Scaffold this active site. Structure first.
Site, PDB file in Angstrom:
ATOM      1  CD  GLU A   1       1.744 -11.900  -4.184  1.00 35.47           C
ATOM      2  OE1 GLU A   1       0.513 -12.020  -4.346  1.00 35.47           O
ATOM      3  OE2 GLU A   1       2.402 -10.927  -4.615  1.00 35.47           O
TER       4      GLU A   1
ATOM      5  CD1 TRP B   1       5.352  -4.956  -7.664  1.00 30.50           C
ATOM      6  CD2 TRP B   1       4.498  -3.269  -8.876  1.00 30.50           C
ATOM      7  NE1 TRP B   1       5.587  -3.786  -6.986  1.00 30.50           N
ATOM      8  CE2 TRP B   1       5.072  -2.739  -7.705  1.00 30.50           C
ATOM      9  CE3 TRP B   1       3.892  -2.394  -9.787  1.00 30.50           C
ATOM     10  CZ2 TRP B   1       5.062  -1.371  -7.424  1.00 30.50           C
ATOM     11  CZ3 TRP B   1       3.889  -1.034  -9.505  1.00 30.50           C
ATOM     12  CH2 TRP B   1       4.468  -0.539  -8.333  1.00 30.50           C
TER      13      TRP B   1
ATOM     14  NE  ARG C   1      -2.449  -1.676   3.379  1.00 29.80           N
ATOM     15  CZ  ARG C   1      -2.873  -1.632   4.641  1.00 29.80           C
ATOM     16  NH1 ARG C   1      -3.808  -0.746   5.001  1.00 29.80           N
ATOM     17  NH2 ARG C   1      -2.345  -2.452   5.547  1.00 29.80           N
TER      18      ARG C   1
END
Ligand code: HEM
Ligand code: HEM
Ligand SMILES: CNCc1cccc(-c2cc(C)cc(N)n2)c1
Ligand SMILES: CNCc1cccc(-c2cc(C)cc(N)n2)c1
Ligand SMILES: C[C@H](O)[C@H](O)[C@H]1CNc2nc(N)[nH]c(=O)c2N1
Ligand SMILES: C[C@H](O)[C@H](O)[C@H]1CNc2nc(N)[nH]c(=O)c2N1
Ligand SMILES: [Zn+2]
Lengths: 418, 414
Positions: free
Chosen positions: B287, B282, B113
């Protein structure tokens, strides 16, 4: 009813035990405090000597629970016990636990410890009653016996030693150490730190009390013991009671030349054990290590021994940029060496893969027999390789059951010296 | 009232006042914490909608230093008129951009964020058909992909009306790989997508039945049956995974897509519900390398990698899983960087999130954050976020979960 799901296996468990929770978590309908270390100051009895209407309800609840646990409730001995505790509080403002109630209470405080991944072992706990202790010399004797019994030449055994409960708050028994065995830390003239930086303040208190520091990187600290509110006293644990493990690596022969070691016995000594409104301010307990505690936190936290840079150099890793994952790569090798070393010396230790798997089985056991298991995901998930362990994928409910282990202030912030 | 959060590595303490502005449930109670529950658990009436709209318009005009202005009071009046006469209302373009950016700013589970104010918002509220949605999504992918220099973007489709005419992207992300269950119980491709792959095949998709088939788009406009579309292959940027030291790694045949694009969430702005709102950023490397590749129920490659590494796999305490996990994540970062496709490693990302969190406490009075999601799934405590206390609460505008559309859609054909 509240359900928790495991997103790997799709097992769903149903929690009704949470209906027995007593204290606030800190959370509300609008805010979650699940990652706050000390979210709540909600306590079951006020600070100093409680009135009758404050202590007796908590005592009754614990005695009711203990007598329920043993297929009684309402029995002759239960009603007499209630009446006995009633007279004791009337005439002394407190009461004394029976030996059986003390053992039950200690084991259930462990059973209720939502931050402990080791609780599959909860009912196999050796309880040493030290409520007859009166001096710091006697406390040292009880602690030496605990350390020797728990170490057991490397075949570690879980134990707790329970010193006299709090009375008025001015006669507390305290172990000032945070663990029975830790390494000193020293502020160096240039500005860096030698040994364990977490213990710099405690080390300074010891030196200020007359301790002669050898001023090395792994100096076992003395015990600082306080009995019946008196000034604390220094004792050196006999070194033959302090099992240590030199750290080496099964492939890197240069690892042993880093001169690392750790101690075998993790023994928490600064927590408070609360049973039926009684507060045992000195209750050191010990078990055995999960390797990540030493390999990840003790060795690699930036504010602890912080050895990642040294290990990575020897490994010849690219340390220009974070994206080479040189920290992650050294981290694994260090934890391999810690496990390899403890196992080579036949000192009990568990890896985070086995420990987390045991805890999932413990959760299942507890939901089946007890209807729930309070568990703090933030503490239970290990500090490395989180999602390749099963607890990462396990939803958990956290709630506060009594008897319990609680935090308490450090004694040097409150002790009025004499 | 004030709440304090402490960082136990730095001893920095921050003071949260922003939590006083939440009014949606966390799922926790005063005696139970549900902070590790994934999902702690049909159209608003006029009376419900008025105060939701007012609160949002008030916060918009406050954000732009015109609270109480003539424009503020007239916008409130205009919104009330619409709700009264039409049971709903329409956002201005400025409000939509502001709402979308703040939904991201308020996403307590997102570590990225620090980037919230640089979001490219595509207004797709004039769309009426699935062919239109496909065109809007192609343009989003092309803009966001940008030949590997990725740019955050969101495309916002018409809001919910009666609940019977929802726009939905049935895919969970814009780009994912198919999964096929084999007769012998093995899975080919991504096991997470076996069910959605079945739906696609049933709707007429002819699958190549390989390990990395990009799935078609399944797009629903105006509550009609969804329709299949193939994203043009030249818009789907992919990175073949190799390792800078293990030349055998490329022989595993691994690849991944460059654009992470969530398409199954719901965007709530001022009581209005945008059920189709795909957004993209992105990747953080873990992940792919940790979850996509090494989750037991995903591609599950730890065994094959450790074998080629010649690790001792007999005992867990050799930490062979841990060792192979690190090398996989090294390969993922090296591959993306070599192909000049934007990616961030978990160390860099968590460090930036701490800076963002401190800035947010300074200028906004807080930053809702979900520690269980912010801490990366490997090497947790060597990242700074592990040592950072966080408060979690729900602010609106917000991104919300919603049911999968195949569990609620009632079909119309034959
Ligand atoms: C028998 C082997 C045991 C293992 C492997 C084990 C494992 C652990 C670990 C890894 C932690 C986290 C420590 C940290 O991050 O500081 C922990 C915390 C804790 N353990 Fe256990 N434990 C064991 C035995 C015990 C025993 C015997 C007791 C008490 C009788 C106990 C009570 C607790 C409590 C209260 C905490 C929370 C400490 C805190 O909040 O600071 N554990 N345990
Ligand atoms: C710009 C670079 C971005 C990065 C590096 C980033 C990073 C991440 C990561 C690692 C996660 C966790 C994913 C998971 O474990 O499933 C996440 C979740 C999330 N992100 Fe971000 N993100 C980025 C952009 C965005 C944007 C542009 C939006 C919306 C406009 C957004 C909204 C969210 C939301 C709502 C979640 C929670 C998803 C859920 O609950 O399933 N992020 N982000
Ligand atoms: C404040 N940290 C608490 C703490 C610090 C250090 C160690 C432990 C621990 C305790 C026990 C009984 C077993 C174990 N494996 N580790 C707990
Ligand atoms: C179910 N998790 C949601 C999910 C799944 C997959 C990826 C993400 C994601 C999204 C964005 C915008 C950036 C990023 N790096 N990753 C989010
Ligand atoms: C802020 C955060 O709660 C804090 O760093 C916690 C995280 N989880 C932990 N988990 C364990 N087992 N031990 C810890 O000391 C911590 N520290
Ligand atoms: C049970 C637990 O809440 C669940 O596995 C969570 C843990 N934290 C996570 N964190 C992120 N970023 N993504 C996830 O999918 C999850 N899964
Ligand atoms: Zn909570």
């Amino acid at each position: 009813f509240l359900k928790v799901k495991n997103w790997e296996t799709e097992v769903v468990l149903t929690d009704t035990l949470h209906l027995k929770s007593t204290l606030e978590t800190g959370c509300t309908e609008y805010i979650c405090m699940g990652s706050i270390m000390h979210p709540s100051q909600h306590a079951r009895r006020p600070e100093d000597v409680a009135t009758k209407d404050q202590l007796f309800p908590l005592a009754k609840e614990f005695i009711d629970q203990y007598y329920s646990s043993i297929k009684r409730f309402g029995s002759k001995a239960h009603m007499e016990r209630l009446e006995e505790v009633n007279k004791e509080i009337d005439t002394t403002s407190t009461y004394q636990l029976k030996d059986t109630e003390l053992i039950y209470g200690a084991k259930h405080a462990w059973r209720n410890a939502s931050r402990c991944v080791g609780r599959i072992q909860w009912s196999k706990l050796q309880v040493f009653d030290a409520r007859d202790c009166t001096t710091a010399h006697g406390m040292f004797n009880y602690i030496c016996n605990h350390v020797k019994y728990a170490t057991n030449k490397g075949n570690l055994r879980s134990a707790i030693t329970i010193f006299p409960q709090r009375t008025d708050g001015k006669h507390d028994f305290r172990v000032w150490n945070s663990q029975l065995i830790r390494y000193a830390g020293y502020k160096q003239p240039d500005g860096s730190t030698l040994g364990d930086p977490a213990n710099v303040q405690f080390t300074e208190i010891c030196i200020q009390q007359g301790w002669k520091p050898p001023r090395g990187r792994f100096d076992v600290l003395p015990l600082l013991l306080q009995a019946n509110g008196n000034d604390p006293e220094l004792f050196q644990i006999p070194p033959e009671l302090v099992l240590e493990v030199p750290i080496r690596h099964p492939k890197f022969e240069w690892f042993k030349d880093l001169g690392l070691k750790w101690y075998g016995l993790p023994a928490v000594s600064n927590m408070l054990l609360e049973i039926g409104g009684l507060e045992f301010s000195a209750c050191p307990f010990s078990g055995w290590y999960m390797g990540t505690e030493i390999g990840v936190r003790d060795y690699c936290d930036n504010s602890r021994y912080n050895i990642l840079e040294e290990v990575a150099k020897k490994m010849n890793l690219d340390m220009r940029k974070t994206s080479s994952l040189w920290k992650d790569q050294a981290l694994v090798e260090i934890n391999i060496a810690v496990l390899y070393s403890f196992q080579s010396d036949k000192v009990t230790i568990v890896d985070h893969h086995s420990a987390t798997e045991s805890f999932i089985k413990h959760m299942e056991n507890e939901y089946r027999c007890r209807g729930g298991c309070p568990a703090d995901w933030v503490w239970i998930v290990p500090p490395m390789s989180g999602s390749i362990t099963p607890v990462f994928h396990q939803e958990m409910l956290n709630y506060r059951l009594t008897p319990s282990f609680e935090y308490q202030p450090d004694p040097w912030n409150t002790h009025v010296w004499k």
